[PDB]
């Protein structure tokens, strides 16, 4: 029962196909639910449970916020281009923020900013200061600190408003967050150069956390297994694969161990 809400902001100075000038995506537990970009300029849903939101002004209020954010980031890109003494060109401004609600009821919050794909400035919300990565970022560290307003405000947002919406979201998203979808496993083999390569693929499991293991007679072959990263399906489920190079002789000694919440016991899978 832990849960997270996170918003991801991307602002670029030169857009390209697929990359609007400004984009904001809201994620509930790593699944998307709201979208806004600078070409349609309206907030729109990305998950059907957002229709349960009872606040009438929700979509119009959040649209205006997003329209604020794109105006301000255009200005931020310009400020940072002068500060770092850069030419006009392709440039990137990014921001992540949100809150977590842990199992015991405690909460965490974050607000991180990045320029040109490197860290820039990040909120330390429990000392109300910012960490700066740069001398350029220290100029911002000083402005927000000497004015002394912004860290206290975001801290209030993260610890309060953000957590109130998360509880509401978690309740609306109950069916989708709690579902369990079993992985569908297939094991494949390939002998090349008197070396047999065994491949395990888990298709369509939900939720995201999974452990996939290659076992020689029930023993983990940890430093011999090469596994992929957890990758998303188009329906909100996940995918993962793990391969193992073996001697063609030892062949029925190998089992793929899939460990996931959908299975009461880890699934054992042979070729």
């Amino acid at each position: 029962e832990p849960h997270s809400v996170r918003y991801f902001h991307t602002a670029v100075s030169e857009p390209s196909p697929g990359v609007p000038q400004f984009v904001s995506v809201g994620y509930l537990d790593g699944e998307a639910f709201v979208y806004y970009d600078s070409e349609t300029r309206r907030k729109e849903p990305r998950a059907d449970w957002t229709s349960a939101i009872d606040d009438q002004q929700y979509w119009e209020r959040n649209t205006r916020i997003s329209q604020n954010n794109e105006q301000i980031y255009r200005v931020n890109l310009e400020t940072l281009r002068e500060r770092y003494n850069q030419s006009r060109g392709s440039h990137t401004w990014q921001r992540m923020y949100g809150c977590d609600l842990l199992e015991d009821g405690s909460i965490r919050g974050f607000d991180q900013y990045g320029y040109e794909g490197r860290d820039f400035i990040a909120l330390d919300k429990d000392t109300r200061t910012f960490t700066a990565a740069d001398a350029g970022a220290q100029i911002t560290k000083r402005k927000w600190e000497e004015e002394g307003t912004f860290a206290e405000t975001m801290k209030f947002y993260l610890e309060n408003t953000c957590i109130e919406w998360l509880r509401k979201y978690v309740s609306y998203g109950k069916d989708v967050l709690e579902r369990r979808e079993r992985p569908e496993v297939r094991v494949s083999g390939m002998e090349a150069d008197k070396i047999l390569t065994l491949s395990c693929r888990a298709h369509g499991f939900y939720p995201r956390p999974i452990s996939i293991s290659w076992l020689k007679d029930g023993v983990v072959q940890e430093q011999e297994t090469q596994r992929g990263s957890t990758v998303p399906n188009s329906d909100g489920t996940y995918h993962i694969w793990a391969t193992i190079d073996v001697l063609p002789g030892d062949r029925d000694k190998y089992q793929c161990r899939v460990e996931h919440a959908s299975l009461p016991q880890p699934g054992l899978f042979s070729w």
Binding site: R61, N62, I65, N68, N69, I72, V75, F150, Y157
Partner: peptide, 9 residues
């Protein structure tokens, strides 16, 4: 819901 306060560098 997103934060109302703006982030001016």
């Amino acid at each position: 819901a997103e934060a109302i306060i703006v982030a001016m560098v």
